[PDB]
Amino acid sequence: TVAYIAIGSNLASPLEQVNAALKALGDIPESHILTVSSFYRTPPLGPQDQPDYLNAAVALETSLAPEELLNHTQRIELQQGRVRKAERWGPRTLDLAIMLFGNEVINTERLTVPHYDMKNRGFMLWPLFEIAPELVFPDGEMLRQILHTRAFDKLNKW
Ligand SMILES: [Cl-]
Ligand SMILES: [Cl-]
Ligand SMILES: [Cl-]
Questions:
Q1: Ligand nearest to the CA of 113
Q2: Ligand 3 center–CA 48 separation, angstroms
Q3: Which ligand sits closest to the CA of 84?
Q4: 153: Cβ contacts below 8 Å, ≥ 6 apart
Q5: Nearest ligand, CA of residue 106?
Q6: Which one-letter DSSP state was computed for residue 36?
Q7: How many domains does the chain have?
Q8: What range defines the domain where residue 83 resides?
Q9: Which DSSP letter does residue 154 get?
Q10: Is 141:150 a contact under the CB 8 Å cutoff?
């Protein structure tokens, strides 16, 4: 199964963390990276005093179950990132989001795939489109059609 994972970091100096997270994704059992998007830079949500966000998409080949993949992505978040004391129960300094898991629709207490809001997020769709321009969502909507119709601005490269 090809899973598509969104990497987000809000560290002032995120490259070391992001590269560590990429290596860690590869170390996941029964899984390996197929490709990684360019790194993209987007404005911090709210006040602009905060560093830019680093955004990227990863194609991960895997034979794990979706929940098993989630276990590992959560572990990597714990090991490579930290709580943001400004929003403790929100995203950590490193966020790994499972955007898509093959053509599967998954709804559980701990996991919703496709990611519940990704179709509204240029910062998730653009890096995904770079590595998977022909992508079709489980409901049959085309990634390319969403980007074109919604007219999201392109992102700046890191
Ligand atoms: Cl920078
Ligand atoms: Cl911490
Ligand atoms: Cl869908």
A1: 3
A2: 33
A3: 2
A4: 122
A5: 3
A6: E
A7: 1
A8: 1-158
A9: P
A10: no
